[PDB]
Amino acid sequence: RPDFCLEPPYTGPCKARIIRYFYNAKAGLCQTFVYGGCRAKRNNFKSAEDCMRTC
Amino acid sequence: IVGGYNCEENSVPYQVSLNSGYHFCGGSLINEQWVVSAGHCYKSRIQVRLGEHNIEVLEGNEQFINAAKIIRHPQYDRDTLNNDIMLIKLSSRAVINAHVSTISLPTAPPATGTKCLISGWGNTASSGADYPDELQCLDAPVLSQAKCEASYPGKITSNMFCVGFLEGGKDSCQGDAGGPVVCNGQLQGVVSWGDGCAQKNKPGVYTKVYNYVKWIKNTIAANS
Ligand SMILES: [Ca+2]
């Protein structure tokens, strides 16, 4: 599990509502959150499958 | 829209929802075939939903029209959000009726103190997530450039302005980008960005539509 998989999800300052995936470390699974549209951190995946693969 | 109220059914007939399988941004109908939205709302395929009020329910007034062209400002900057504007040409004309109509382009820049209406289906909570079905409205004033700059030092270009309240509690939020800021019947802004939603000393930053008038005229012309 890369260490970036431990970051909390990061919405960023933009105000879109883009459904993205993030690894929730405690819960041990890929979960949905709201991504604002700019300034993505790496714990931010475009599908569950990508998220599950990396993290 | 944090700290807003349900807009009356179809009282913002120019408001659109952009949809990629779900509502992701707003926009403004500025003519029968063109919608203005923000640059960071870009995607290669977008369905434009007009005459919506409740985005969960087919009421019977909605027109669902595919985006035939999607033209982000060519100097949109993803890092600074400068030139955060985008045009969408609809694949067919919108049928103008009482629930769908256009909003005029601004004829002068925003004027400080002017009371504007901001609308959207974005988060209504300043922390956590409370995304509404019903279109949300919010009355808010244009802030001076000094306040805007004090709030976001070094981050505001002459293409941005601030609308809201330094005391916090009322603001646009995630899911509102691309939607309108309307003052005395003119489209003065596009919901663009901010540090959180509705936080003290952090009003929303909005793209200054007046600055893009020519670009909009020309892009329309070149794609007519
Ligand atoms: Ca509806």
- Give φ, ψ of A45 to 5 degrees: -125, 150
Can you give the CATH number for the domain in which B23 is found? 2.40.10.10
Q: Which of B135, B146, B166, B137 is nearest to B62 (CA)?
A: B135
Strand partners, B31: B34
What is the C-alpha to C-alpha distance for residues B17 and B171, in angstroms, rounded to an integer?
Answer: 18
B47: number of Cβ within 10 Å: 14
User: Of B123, B131, B194, which has the smallest distance from its Cβ to A13's Cβ?
Assistant: B194
Cα angle value A26/A38/B111 (rounded, 5°): 130
Which residues are within 5 Å of ligand 1 (an ion), measured at CB?
A: B 52, 54, 57, 59
SS (H, E, C) B17-39: EEECCCEEEEEEEEECCEEEECH
Asked whether residue B155 falls in the same domain as residue B199, the answer is yes
Asked whether residue B45 falls in the same domain as residue B60, the answer is yes
Asked whether residue B77 falls in the same domain as residue B97, the answer is yes
What is the C-alpha to C-alpha distance for residues B65 and B89, in angstroms, rounded to an integer?
Answer: 10
Please note each residue after which chain B is broken, C-to-N distance over 2.5 A, or write none.
Answer: none
Strand partners, B117: B139, B182
Q: Do B25 and A17 touch (CB under 8 A)?
A: yes
- The total number of structural domains that make up chain A: 1
From ligand 1's centre to the CA of B38, what distance in Å? 22
Q: Do A15 and B177 touch (CB under 8 A)?
A: yes
Method of elucidation: X-ray
- Which tokens belong to A50? 């990508």
Burial of A10 (0-12, 13-18, 19+ CB in 10 A): middle
Asked whether residue B138 falls in the same domain as residue B31, the answer is no
Q: What is the DSSP string of B99-160?
A: S----BPPSS---TT-EEEEEESS---SSS----SB-EEEEEEBPPHHHHHHHSTTT--TTE
Which are the contacts of B171, defined by CB distance < 8 A and separation ≥ 6? B1, B2, B3, B126, B138, B164, B165, B194, B197, B198, B199, B202, B203, B204
Q: Residue A52's domain spans which residues?
A: 1-55
- The total number of structural domains that make up chain B: 2
Name the DSSP letter for residue B40. Answer: G
Q: Residue B39's domain spans which residues?
A: 13-102+211-224
Asked whether residue B219 falls in the same domain as residue B143, the answer is no
Q: Please give the resolution of this entry in Å, rounded to 1 decimal.
A: 2.1
What is the C-alpha to C-alpha distance for residues A23 and A39, in angstroms, rounded to an integer?
Answer: 18
Distance from CA of B43 to the nearest CA of A (A): 11
- Which tokens belong to B59? 């009421």
Can you give the CATH number for the domain in which A46 is found? 4.10.410.10
What is the C-alpha to C-alpha distance for residues B30 and B154, in angstroms, rounded to an integer?
Answer: 31
Q: Do A14 and B123 touch (CB under 8 A)?
A: no
Q: Do B193 and A34 touch (CB under 8 A)?
A: no
Asked whether residue B79 falls in the same domain as residue B59, the answer is yes
From ligand 1's centre to the CA of B28, what distance in Å? 17
Q: CA nearest B25 in A: which residue? A: A16
Rounded to whole angstroms, the maximal C-alpha distance in chain A is 30
For residue A15, the chain B residues in CB contact (below 8 A) are 38, 122, 172-177, 191-194, 197, 204
